[PDB]
Design a protein around this ligand. Structure first.
Ligand code: GUN
Ligand code: MG
Ligand code: MG
Ligand code: MG
Ligand code: MG
Ligand code: MG
Ligand code: MG
Ligand code: MG
Ligand code: MG
Ligand code: MG
Ligand code: MG
Ligand code: MG
Ligand code: MG
Ligand code: MG
Ligand code: MG
Ligand code: MG
Ligand code: MG
Ligand code: MG
Ligand code: MG
Ligand code: MG
Ligand code: MG
Ligand code: MG
Ligand code: MG
Ligand code: MG
Ligand code: MG
Ligand code: MG
Ligand code: MG
Ligand code: MG
Ligand code: MG
Ligand code: MG
Ligand code: MG
Ligand code: MG
Ligand code: MG
Ligand code: MG
Ligand code: MG
Ligand code: MG
Ligand code: MG
Ligand code: MG
Ligand code: MG
Ligand code: MG
Ligand code: MG
Ligand code: MG
Ligand code: MG
Ligand code: MG
Ligand code: MG
Ligand code: MG
Ligand code: MG
Lengths: 125, 114, 209, 56, 123
RNA sequence: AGGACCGAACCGACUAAUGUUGAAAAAUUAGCGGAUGACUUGUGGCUGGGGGUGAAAGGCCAAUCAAACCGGGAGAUAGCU
RNA sequence: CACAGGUGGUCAGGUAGAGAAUACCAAGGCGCUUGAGAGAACUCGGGUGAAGGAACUAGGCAAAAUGGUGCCGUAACUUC
RNA sequence: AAUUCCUUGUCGGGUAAGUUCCGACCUGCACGAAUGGCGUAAUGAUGGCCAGGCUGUCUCCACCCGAGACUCAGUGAAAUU
RNA sequence: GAUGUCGGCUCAUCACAUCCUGGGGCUGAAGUAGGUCCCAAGGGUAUGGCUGUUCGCCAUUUAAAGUGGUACGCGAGCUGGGUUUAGAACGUCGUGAGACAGUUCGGUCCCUAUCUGCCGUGGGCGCUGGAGAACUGAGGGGGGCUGCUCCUAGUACGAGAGGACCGGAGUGGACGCAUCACUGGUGUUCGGGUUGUCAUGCCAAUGGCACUGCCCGGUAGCUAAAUGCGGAAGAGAUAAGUGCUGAAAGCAUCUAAGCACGAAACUUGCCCCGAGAUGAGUUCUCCCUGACCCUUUAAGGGUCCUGAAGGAACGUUGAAGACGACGACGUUGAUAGGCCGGGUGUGUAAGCGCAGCGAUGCGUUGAGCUAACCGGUACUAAUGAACCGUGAGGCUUAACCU
């Protein structure tokens, strides 16, 4: 059974699933909005939303912690410097999921995942 | 869960002394020695602590007559009268399950001076 | 005697004065308001229909709402009937408390078991597994032979086979009634009861010894 | 395990009784774009619940 | 949790050192023996001039187990090894005159009364 | 020194599971034997069908060898279906 | 067959290593031409298991186990 | 006994219990001297038997990680009748 | 123009010529224990050594270790040890090739389930206007085992030795269900230690890979070894049996009339399913109150207007789940995620300071981190809407009411 168990396997092993969510949580922080399949999108929320909760407090530890979680200094920068103080007031729920259509080649149900308070100027550059 | 926590703390002990793994405790327990109700002691190393409110337990190991004897005490049980730290133990891990394969001289636990 | 509808809060323990741990199941039994009294003249049998707790006004349909309306009681999560002993009498609207079991020694608890989903013969029927090795071919948990030969040349009805396990009506009998607390809408019973936390139960006084 | 008799065309037609599709009845129109889109789905021009949410 | 083929140490001066459980007595298909249940044993290792010899088939009361006994409060008592006490085949009484190691208060019953007195420690 | 020892490449193929409308008309995976020798391998050459070759299993001789394949006698014959 | 098979010779970076083993890497080359979900029985392939330890079975099949270097030390028998 | 039908021969050993094993006897249905007899150290992916260790082999299954199985989209077989 | 063989495993189902438990007649039955027969099929009915063995012998249990049928049940369920291939040997037979119904060593077990059957689970329509609940209970299934000790009583009984009936209490074995509070197992999503190597410039910290690299612990969950509960008592009608009254047959006679008893079998009783119970039942509540045309004029066909209750959809989901189904919630909102506080688990993070040549230690510091958990919180997402389903519902008769 699956009684009270949390977390999708997404037809991938632990190490793969982890690295995929490390890259994806990167891509979102960078482009502030990404298109992906709805199940992945819904799981990405459990990865990215606490990274921002970290970035709300600037510290050497917190920075290294988020670093070990992202493995990209470009992302840890954007987090503590920008997003943290952007979502400074906001008590969770830093992302939004917009269901779009269905992918061609495989009929997967797609979605957009964006940062609640989006910067169209940081997203393009 | 709210009702359950209410029913549990009203049954919970308030006087429990602090002890951690490594510490050598002397559990004074209520027993019926045939036609008598007296206190028996069980002085041994605390090798495990389970923290679960009312359901909190702990494992005490002693080497009685060459053989190892562990006892699992339910902390909030009325059976358990007193708990007393006889020596403060110095260990790293929270479960000293490795000790079960150690004898006499190898099994010694350093004193925690602090 | 009548029964009361309740809710499974969960299992805990009770430590006695003589240092014994009684394993208990906390049962939240709020008041059970009568919504219909069934009599021989109108229904052909004697029973009381009751409701308990509350239900979202928007979630209460026009037919349900009106049924409750007639009784002059607030809508509950559902309705359950209890057959009346010769003599037992109640009025519509009359509220029943867990204190009904205040002097009932043992009770029978009817719940809805947790659902295991599709279960194999090994779990479902306690079938013994075939050999793990010694040349066994893709036949470890399988049910083995399911019949004879030309005679009868069919599988008999009721054959123990894999299928849906759990999530069904289950009664546990003769459980010791540990505590009754009106003020706290509580019932304490020795031993486990069917169902998951938060599911509905039915407490009735023990039918057997 | 194969068949002993050819199943008939009626039997084929029978097995296929629950094979029919379900027309999407969930189409709504956007109060701003005047665009058909699925219920709880962004429009082809990136509109959702009247606001332009995606710039695509 | 003693069963057929389970080897046990001896908690007495009966002469036996190692005994093997050959049958869990006390009911058809009975699976396990626990602290205070009678078993049929075969002596596998024995001292040169003790009361019993190697190969002797007889009975035994289990006194200590690795699984151990439970108490009304939930309290467990685990021992480091499974050990029994040799019993006279028909009399179901102790072959030894002395008991070694600690035993539990579970034994206190009229037929195992001897064992708890002689016993050095009772838990 | 050695048809010496342990062990990769290389040469084998003892066990198990899988696979058995296979990934494969003989494999894969884990373990296994030999590994300076009667070792192993590239290229080219000789031996042809009652014939070859064979540390011999009727083995092998181009995916079925107690007598290869192709074509012919040929529509052999078939008291059999 | 765009097939887990078969196919002779040459080359031999770094750290660890006895090594051409193995592990991670370099240069270089690839993710194997259906994907998305879900997380039932059952099958394959793995990880861990309380107490017991061959009671399994035709048979310890299969697992599990052992595993390196140096030194100490090593029985019957023997063609030494 | 790779040989013994009667036969699980008899005895001794090992085990709680041993149609196998080891030792012994001889009544060899139907051993026997290069169709070699009888021994033998070493060697053996050889056959029988025992012990320690070891464990899901078993008591008696549990839980977990993966590839299928199931659902959606694309492609799209087979034996048989 | 193929019905796979012994034995095992897994799973069984029936008979009763009954192994145990139950009732009972005789006994060469004192008691205890037997012997024999009658009734009885409800449940129960060992594990090992040896051998391929079934069987059997043996060991040790047990209340018992039943006898048979089911293609000597069961290979499109597994095994392949026995037994018919091809290799080889011994004995024996034959000049020989070879042979044995003699032994011995080795030796390929395919099949994606169309029909029936069976286990689960849905879709349709029906039940006469539609709809939501709660029931009734025709019927079907499940279950049904038993040891030991104690009281009566060391009494009846017996010369003792011994040792009960009836009835009552307690505790087990085996089996079944449910549960996760406890003891635990697992827990590749939590925390720590560590080996090799590569990377983040480097130090310091970290991450990747090496079975989760190798390990130590462990949350929720699932779960057995864990801990609750069950078999019943009672009622009815009986079996074999035991009798009361009693003729036929002045007597006798359990039987012919009448009457009292009598079993784990049977019907109830307990548990589950259950009105497709088409014989489609009941109870309560809810919803709908426009016209027109045509024809073969009738339970006729169509059009306009209408679109209720309800169901469903779509979304967030669930200790519900293959899918379907079932439950919770959808802003008048805790349904999921996030967020806050707590718990739990791991075991004193980073950084800095001090001690030491250094490995390393100490203080800050029970630190840091912490999944599925408990208590909260609208921060993100659950949108106003659509679709199916209608528009007062047949005739006959009776009883009321007009
Ligand atoms: N979207 C939506 N919200 C609801 N809230 C309550 N009922 C409904 C419903 O049918 N649809
Ligand atoms: Mg896939
Ligand atoms: Mg890895
Ligand atoms: Mg109900
Ligand atoms: Mg479930
Ligand atoms: Mg088995
Ligand atoms: Mg196979
Ligand atoms: Mg297998
Ligand atoms: Mg068959
Ligand atoms: Mg028939
Ligand atoms: Mg050599
Ligand atoms: Mg090669
Ligand atoms: Mg290989
Ligand atoms: Mg070798
Ligand atoms: Mg070698
Ligand atoms: Mg050549
Ligand atoms: Mg030949
Ligand atoms: Mg001619
Ligand atoms: Mg011809
Ligand atoms: Mg390809
Ligand atoms: Mg290599
Ligand atoms: Mg184990
Ligand atoms: Mg262990
Ligand atoms: Mg051992
Ligand atoms: Mg055996
Ligand atoms: Mg066996
Ligand atoms: Mg092996
Ligand atoms: Mg291994
Ligand atoms: Mg043996
Ligand atoms: Mg001999
Ligand atoms: Mg060789
Ligand atoms: Mg045919
Ligand atoms: Mg009879
Ligand atoms: Mg007779
Ligand atoms: Mg029977
Ligand atoms: Mg007997
Ligand atoms: Mg047969
Ligand atoms: Mg097969
Ligand atoms: Mg031959
Ligand atoms: Mg034969
Ligand atoms: Mg009826
Ligand atoms: Mg982590
Ligand atoms: Mg460093
Ligand atoms: Mg029903
Ligand atoms: Mg420190
Ligand atoms: Mg927290
Ligand atoms: Mg109308």
């Amino acid at each position: 059974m699956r009684h009270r168990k949390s977390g999708r396997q997404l037809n991938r092993n632990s190490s793969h699933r982890q690295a995929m969510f490390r890259n994806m949580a990167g891509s979102l922080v960078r482009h502030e909005i990404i298109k992906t399949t709805l199940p992945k999108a819904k799981e990405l929320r459990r990865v990215v939303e606490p990274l921002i909760t970290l970035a709300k407090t600037d510290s050497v530890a917190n920075r290294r912690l988020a670093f070990a979680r992202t493995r990209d200094n470009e992302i840890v920068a954007k987090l503590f410097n920008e997003l943290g103080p952007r979502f400074a007031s906001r008590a969770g729920g830093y992302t939004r999921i917009l269901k779009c259509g269905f992918r061609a080649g495989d009929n997967a149900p797609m979605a957009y995942i964006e940062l609640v308070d989006r910067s169209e100027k940081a997203e393009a550059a | 869960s709210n009702i359950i926590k209410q029913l549990e703390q009203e049954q919970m002990k308030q006087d429990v002394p602090s002890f951690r793994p490594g510490d050598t405790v002397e559990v004074k327990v209520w027993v019926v020695e045939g036609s008598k109700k007296r206190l028996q002691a069980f002085e041994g190393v605390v090798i495990a602590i389970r923290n679960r409110g009312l359901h909190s337990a702990f494992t005490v190991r002693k080497i009685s007559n060459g053989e190892g004897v562990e006892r699992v005490f339910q902390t909030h049980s009325p059976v358990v009268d007193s708990i007393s730290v006889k020596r403060r133990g110095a260990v790293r891990k929270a479960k000293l399950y490795y000790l079960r394969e150690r004898t006499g001289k190898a099994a010694r636990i350093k004193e925690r001076l602090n | 005697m009548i029964g009361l509808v309740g809710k499974k809060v969960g299992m805990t323990r009770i430590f006695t004065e003589d240092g014994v741990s009684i394993p208990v199941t906390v049962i939240e039994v709020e008041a059970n308001r009568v919504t219909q009294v069934k009599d021989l003249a109108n229904d052909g049998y004697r029973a009381i229909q009751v409701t308990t707790g509350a239900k979202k006004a928007n979630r209460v349909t026009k037919p349900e709402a009106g049924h409750f309306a007639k009784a002059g009681v607030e809508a509950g999560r559902g309705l359950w009937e209890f057959r009346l002993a010769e003599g037992e009498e109640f009025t519509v609207g009359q509220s029943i408390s867990v204190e009904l079991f205040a002097d009932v020694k043992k009770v029978d608890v009817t719940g809805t078991s947790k659902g295991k989903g599709f279960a194999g013969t090994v779990k479902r029927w306690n079938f013994r597994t075939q050999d793990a090795t010694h040349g066994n071919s893709l036949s470890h948990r399988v049910p083995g032979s399911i019949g004879q030969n030309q005679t009868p040349g069919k599988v008999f009805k009721g054959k123990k086979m894999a299928g849906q396990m759990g999530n069904e009506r289950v009664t546990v009998q003769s459980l010791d009634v540990v505590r009754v607390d009106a003020e706290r809408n509580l019932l304490l019973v020795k031993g486990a009861v069917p169902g998951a936390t938060g599911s509905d139960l039915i407490v009735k006084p023990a039918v057997k010894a | 395990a194969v068949q002993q008799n050819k199943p008939t065309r009626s039997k084929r037609g029978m097995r296929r009784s629950h094979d029919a599709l379900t027309a999407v009845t969930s189409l709504s129109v956007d109060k701003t774009s005047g665009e058909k889109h699925l219920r709880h789905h962004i429009t082809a021009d990136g509109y959702y619940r009247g606001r332009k949410v995606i710039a695509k | 949790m003693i069963q057929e083929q389970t080897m046990l140490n001896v908690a007495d001066n009966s002469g036996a050192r190692r005994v093997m459980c050959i049958k869990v007595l006390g009911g058809s298909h009975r699976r396990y023996a626990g602290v205070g249940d009678i078993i049929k044993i075969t002596i596998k290792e024995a001292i040169p001039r003790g009361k019993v010899k190697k190969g002797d088939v007889l009975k035994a009361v289990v006194v200590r187990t690795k699984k151990g006994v439970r108490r009304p409060d939930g309290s467990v008592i685990r021992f480091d090894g499974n050990a029994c006490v040799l019993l006279n085949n028909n009399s179901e009484q102790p072959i030894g005159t002395r008991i070694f190691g600690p035993v539990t208060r579970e034994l206190r019953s009229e037929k195992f009364m001897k064992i708890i007195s002689l016993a050095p420690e009772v838990l």
